Amino acid sequence: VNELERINCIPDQPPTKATCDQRGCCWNPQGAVSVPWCYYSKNHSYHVEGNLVNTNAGFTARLKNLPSSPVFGSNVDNVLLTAEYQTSNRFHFKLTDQTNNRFEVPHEHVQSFSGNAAASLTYQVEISRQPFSIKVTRRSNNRVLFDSSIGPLLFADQFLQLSTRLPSTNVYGLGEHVHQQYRHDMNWKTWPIFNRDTTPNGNGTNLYGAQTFFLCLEDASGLSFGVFLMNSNAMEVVLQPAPAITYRTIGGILDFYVFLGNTPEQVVQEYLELIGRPALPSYWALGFHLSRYEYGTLDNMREVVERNRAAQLPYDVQHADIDYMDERRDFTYDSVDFKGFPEFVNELHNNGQKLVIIVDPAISNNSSSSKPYGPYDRGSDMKIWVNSSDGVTPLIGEVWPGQTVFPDYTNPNCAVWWTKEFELFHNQVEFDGIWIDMNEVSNFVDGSVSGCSTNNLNNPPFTPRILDGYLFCKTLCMDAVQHWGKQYDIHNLYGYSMAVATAEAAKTVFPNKRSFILTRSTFAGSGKFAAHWLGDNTATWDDLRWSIPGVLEFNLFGIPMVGPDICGFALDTPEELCRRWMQLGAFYPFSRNHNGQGYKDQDPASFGADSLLLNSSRHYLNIRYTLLPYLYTLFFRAHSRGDTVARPLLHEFYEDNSTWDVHQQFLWGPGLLITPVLDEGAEKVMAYVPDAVWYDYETGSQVRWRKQKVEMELPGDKIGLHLRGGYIFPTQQPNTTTLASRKNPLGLIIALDENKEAKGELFWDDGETKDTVANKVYLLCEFSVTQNRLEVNISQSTYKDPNNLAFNEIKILGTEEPSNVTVKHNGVPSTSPTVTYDSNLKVAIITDIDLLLGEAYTVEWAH
């Protein structure tokens, strides 16, 4: 064995020859740091027994265990391999215990496959007999994509493992973690996955969510593939420089999907086609959100709101954290400190703003006939709590209010309970959206108020390297019991089940509306239901840098509406950091400035009504709002086709290997390049300029750089923003709310390519109705520019905005002077627009034009 290819046989303890011999592995204490001294042999594992059997969907094989002594339990004797050729670009295989049913994720979106093997496969599947291995290769070039032959298949009740070689080291994904870099180096690295309330810091631990998806860019041609494991048990993913990746899990079954694409974007699209495409956000959820833990009183909250309104900050949503509650209890508000709450909400609404309230899962069990607590009384009547292992007594833990029980959101009768709680509360405080937190689930005691019994669930043969080394640390007992099964098996599905139930509640509370759900904990497929934030970060320059890979990864995971707490949750934010963070933060898909308890104010206006930070924050938030029709159309493509929103350079520029590890810059869709200053004291950033025409957003000027590293001059008041030649960006005059800004004149920014051509599109609907796309109530138009000509073209036309909207300005970058501008409407001429032209910058701006939204036009000019 070449040392890069050794598969570690002692993941659980420091390596010894005696343990190696006892396990029947190979011993070689010679090797570079991290190279396993003890590793699985060439042979041993499982072998194929007899022949493969053709089925309608693909094939089955029986695998029989090559005997050895138990490591972490003894391998299941007979394993069944079921292989389904589901589509041309998606292969599914699962490994089950041939004799017993095992836990399988009861995913809400994924359906069982029936039907026949797809035609025109882009992949071929190869099975080796002795020992068992599975290989998936790309048909067109025979590139080996998945190849398990590097390691054994291990399949014991509480220890399952399968490895695969990888065709390159361009590997992106896995979660939820702070990876720090976007491209995984492929040096010996183990990532534990198990939903846990812990700080997203530099220690590389398991965080709030469970995401097994990874994408691999195979080569410069763009050809890419992805892998997904459908398994909700505690697990870790081991990366090594072969290159190779091992999945090591402690229950369930190995249920794998392999996705192929011509480009990275097509791999994400194939993945989201399987697990579920993201929900379309309400248009208002794309504006700026402001928040903090512990305003303390409504007076203090109103004070913050009003100083940011007075500053003309674009500011659509105010969040209210646990301080609104009466003693941190769900579905109450503090009648003294938040006296006047309903009247404040009216004020918010009348100002065009929205209210999002935090709701925790854990319910106070403190209720007597003297002093009733309704959510607990109604919950106990319905019998909808998570129970201890006896299957009958509700588990007691502790969160914000004191001792608590936990809803079992897997029980469909729990959504009924939860919905009524929301109905009852909305009658008091008319919130518009819901922020669901602490849903790993997070417990202030370990397991329960009486701890956890010693047994194989709470104390398993092998524990992945999760924070603190016990599964029940700061969560529920592993033998706690829910409708979908035991906590051991479904722990990673709590936040997922809770987002599903919460989306159910929205159907009653916000009939026909999307509303907004923000969730902490996630499983694969959570973006169908919710936005995500990156959790309790810290006001450091490290946390600023680390945010970008975290945002890009959740876009691969199909949770495109994602961002961190701008300026940092924990700690007092320095002015310089917060100013650089607000500049970048104006371009996160989810843009929220949120702050921890006790720390100095960090809302933009708090820095002073004439401060650089406020001026800069207002400036870039106004740019964000200007480009909201472009951002919104990007979320439309994510929702309907599965595209990313916040996009890596390498997804558009994969032919250039200089982009393969860029994580300090990113794109909005194909066309907008964002380059933040991310270092203290810097007024410059070393940045990559991909192989395209680029125009400075602010001046419109063509940059002299192409396909090269540059130092971009970015003073205290700037972030780099460039528009790609070849693309047309729809815009709308901004205002301090989207309620108002949506009524304003539209514009087009045409960035010309070398041939003086460009293309773009605009999606437009009512901005809030649920499933306008599935029910086809929307406008979609295309803009295309050739020499001397712009065409506005309508493809779907089943929504006409009642506000009489129109394009009143067109800015053309990289153009020679356009003259004699003519506008035709469905063929008919007329009259004559104004053109202003800057021959130095090659910018033309056409005004005094009125192109109605949803109407076809041709706009023509001479040179």
Ligand X SMILES: *[C@@H]1O[C@H](CO)[C@@H](O[C@@H]2O[C@H](CO)[C@@H](O)[C@H](O)[C@H]2NC(C)=O)[C@H](O)[C@H]1NC(C)=O
Ligand Y SMILES: O=S(=O)([O-])O[C@@H]([C@H](O)[C@H](O)[C@@H](O)CO)[C@H](O)C[S@+]1C[C@@H](O)[C@H](O)[C@H]1CO
Ligand Z SMILES: *[C@@H]1O[C@H](CO)[C@@H](O[C@H]2O[C@H](CO)[C@@H](O)[C@H](O)[C@H]2NC(C)=O)[C@H](O)[C@H]1NC(C)=O
Please report, in range form, the residues annotated as the binding site for acarbose. 197, 321, 520, 536, 594
Closer CB to ligand X, 479 or 761, in the complex: 479
Closer CB to ligand Y, 325 or 586, in the complex: 325
Note whether 180 binds ligand NAG by CB under 6 A.
no
Q: Where are the beta strands (DSSP E) in 460-570?
A: 481-482, 485-486, 517-519, 531-533, 562-563, 565-566
- Pairing assessment for the beta strands 708-713 and 694-696 based on DSSP bridges: unpaired
Closer CB to ligand Y, 536 or 553, in the complex: 536
Q: Among 497, 352, 476, which Cα is nearest to 406's?
A: 476
Name the residue type at position 78.
Answer: N
Total number of residues shown for the chain: 863
User: Which residues, numbered 555-614, are part of the site for ligand Y (CB under 6 A)?
Assistant: 596-597
Which active-site residues does the annotation give? 437, 440
User: Which residues, numbered 328-367, are part of the site for ligand Z (CB under 6 A)?
Assistant: 352
Note whether 226 binds ligand Y by CB under 6 A.
no
Note whether 391 binds ligand X by CB under 6 A.
yes
User: Which residues, numbered 512-531, are part of the site for ligand NAG (CB under 6 A)?
Assistant: none
Note whether 553 binds ligand Y by CB under 6 A.
no
Stretch that binds ligand Y, among 195-203, 231-239, 661-669, 822-830 (CB under 6 A): 195-203
Note whether 60 binds ligand NAG by CB under 6 A.
no
- 440 by Cβ neighbours in 10 Å (0-12 / 13-18 / 19+) ranks as buried
Binds ligand Y by CB under 6 A, chosen from 84, 265, 321, 603: 321
Closer CB to ligand Y, 123 or 533, in the complex: 533
Report the partner that residue 203 touches, choosing among ligand X, ligand Y, ligand NAG, none (CB closer than 5 to 8 A by kind): ligand NAG
On whether the CB atoms of residues 19 and 13 are closer than 8 A, the answer is yes
On whether the CB atoms of residues 490 and 232 are closer than 8 A, the answer is yes
Binds ligand X by CB under 6 A, chosen from 481, 539, 631, 780: 481
Note whether 55 binds ligand NAG by CB under 6 A.
no
Binds ligand Y by CB under 6 A, chosen from 26, 153, 311, 358: 358
CA distance 677 to 544: 10
Report the partner that residue 265 touches, choosing among ligand Z, ligand X, ligand Y, none (CB closer than 5 to 8 A by kind): none
Q: Among 686, 644, 682, 691, which Cα is nearest to 665's?
A: 686
On whether the CB atoms of residues 245 and 237 are closer than 8 A, the answer is yes
User: Which residues, numbered 722-751, are part of the site for ligand Z (CB under 6 A)?
Assistant: 735, 740, 744
Stretch that binds ligand Y, among 196-204, 220-228, 306-314, 679-687 (CB under 6 A): 196-204
Helix (H) or strand (E) holding 613: helix 612-626
On whether the CB atoms of residues 758 and 728 are closer than 8 A, the answer is yes
Instruction: Give the C-alpha distances (Å, rounded to integers) separating 784 from 447, 672, 798, 852.
Output: 60, 18, 21, 17
Q: In whole angstroms, how close is the CB of 230 to ligand NAG at the nearest point?
A: 31
Closer CB to ligand Z, 53 or 740, in the complex: 740
Closer CB to ligand Z, 739 or 752, in the complex: 739
Known binding-site residues equal: 197, 321, 520, 536, 594
556 CB-near residues (< 8 Å, 6+ apart)? 172, 173, 213, 215, 268, 271, 644
Q: In whole angstroms, how close is the CB of 444 to ligand Y at the nearest point?
A: 8
64 CB-near residues (< 8 Å, 6+ apart)? 46, 47, 48, 49, 77, 78, 79
Q: In whole angstroms, how close is the CB of 490 to ligand X at the nearest point?
A: 11
Note whether 543 binds ligand Y by CB under 6 A.
no
Note whether 387 binds ligand X by CB under 6 A.
yes
Stretch that binds ligand X, among 20-28, 36-44, 386-394, 595-603 (CB under 6 A): 386-394
Q: How many amino acids of this chain bind ligand Z (CB under 6 A)?
A: 4
CA distance 426 to 356: 12
Q: In whole angstroms, how close is the CB of 467 to ligand NAG at the nearest point?
A: 9
Binds ligand NAG by CB under 6 A, chosen from 34, 203, 428, 793: 203
Note whether 201 binds ligand NAG by CB under 6 A.
yes
Upper half-sphere CA count for residue 688 (Cβ side, 13 Å): 19
Note whether 497 binds ligand X by CB under 6 A.
no
Tokens of 666: 């990113």
Report the partner that residue 596 touches, choosing among ligand Y, ligand Z, ligand X, none (CB closer than 5 to 8 A by kind): ligand Y
On whether the CB atoms of residues 481 and 391 are closer than 8 A, the answer is yes
- Pairing assessment for the beta strands 517-519 and 531-533 based on DSSP bridges: parallel
For 684, the 3-state DSSP assignment is strand
| Cα-based angle 277, 489, 530 (whole degrees, multiple of 5) | 25
Note whether 608 binds ligand NAG by CB under 6 A.
no
* Residues within the interface to ligand NAG (CB under 6 A): 201-203
* Residues within the interface to ligand Z (CB under 6 A): 352, 735, 740, 744
